Amino acid sequence: PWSFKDDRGTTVKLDKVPANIVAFTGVAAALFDYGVEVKGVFGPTTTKDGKPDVQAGDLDVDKVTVLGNEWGKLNVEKYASLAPEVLITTTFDTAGTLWSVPEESKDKVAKLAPSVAISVFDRQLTQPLQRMWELAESLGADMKAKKVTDAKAAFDKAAARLRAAAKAKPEIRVLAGSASPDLFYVSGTNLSVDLEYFKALGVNFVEPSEDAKKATGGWFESLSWENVDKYPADVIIMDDRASTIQPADITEGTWKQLPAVKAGQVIARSPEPILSYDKCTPLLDNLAEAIENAKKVG
């Protein structure tokens, strides 16, 4: 028998370990790094060139059945066809809302299999990493596999590296942004698993006021493109997801004139980390590297 109590406090119990798992693409990507296969995914999975999306990690995107290829899309008839035994996703709120399960069909989806949510709300990254590790082991992973303990050691090494970098370079101000056509969004550290952890390790973030973030309940501040120079920043970390405009493609003149952009001090941020140590290690290394080499320019 298999049992797991998720971050909504609900305990799913099945008579056997589920063989037919369906997961949000980023959760399937994490389980893949622990050698747990899924049968179906939903979420940003492939790009228009047919390549794996960043949230698909190392998943074999040809083998799995893609039920939806963007956030909030999940075809229920095709989901039923997988004979699903559990659905697994993340959750970003107090309510335990299942991330990316279409609101208009979530009840239909829930009829066909129990769900497991891993919370990525209002906590540090190490939390959901260890919760996802426990889930993967319950599903048949070997958590004492050298691939996995090496991964955890590499993550701990990269976390010490970011702590050291932030101690060496306390003057380097990091801005977390996400680009869309109407607005550039500046995140605060509070509420995000990655940013809360990077902050705990000593990174100096630009922090919009709580007043400036209240239109999103404290997640981020919306700025017009002409006002992206509001906060002086030395390193900018930009949202990497499918729905957002990547830094190479931002054509707006105010952006191109940013001290950080002119200095080449822009890297990716993954606001939806794939919850494996393997895939979170680069998030620490990349930010450490940027801080280690950054010039104060903002």
Side-chain angles (χ1 to χ4, degrees), residues 161 169 172 235 265 287-296:
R161 176 189 177 179
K169 299 293 285 290
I172 301 299
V235 171
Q265 293 175 1
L287 180 59
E289 179 181 51
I291 290 172
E292 289 157 2
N293 296 103
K295 290 164 212 304
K296 179 179 190 200

Side-chain angles (χ1 to χ4, degrees), residues 86-149:
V86 67
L87 181 145
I88 312 185
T89 191
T90 50
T91 180
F92 286 85
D93 62 9
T94 292
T97 299
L98 298 181
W99 183 239
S100 203
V101 175
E103 189 75 15
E104 68 272 23
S105 60
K106 61 188 193 194
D107 63 316
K108 302 175 173 181
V109 170
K111 301 307 197 185
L112 289 155
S115 56
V116 165
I118 303 298
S119 182
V120 294
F121 181 52
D122 202 12
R123 63 198 58 204
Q124 293 177 33
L125 184 59
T126 43
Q127 184 130 24
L129 283 173
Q130 65 158 107
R131 292 292 281 134
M132 189 63 77
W133 167 298
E134 295 163 2
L135 174 57
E137 195 184 331
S138 80
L139 298 169
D142 306 342
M143 290 309 190
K144 286 160 54 227
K146 204 220 192 101
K147 180 173 207 268
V148 176
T149 58

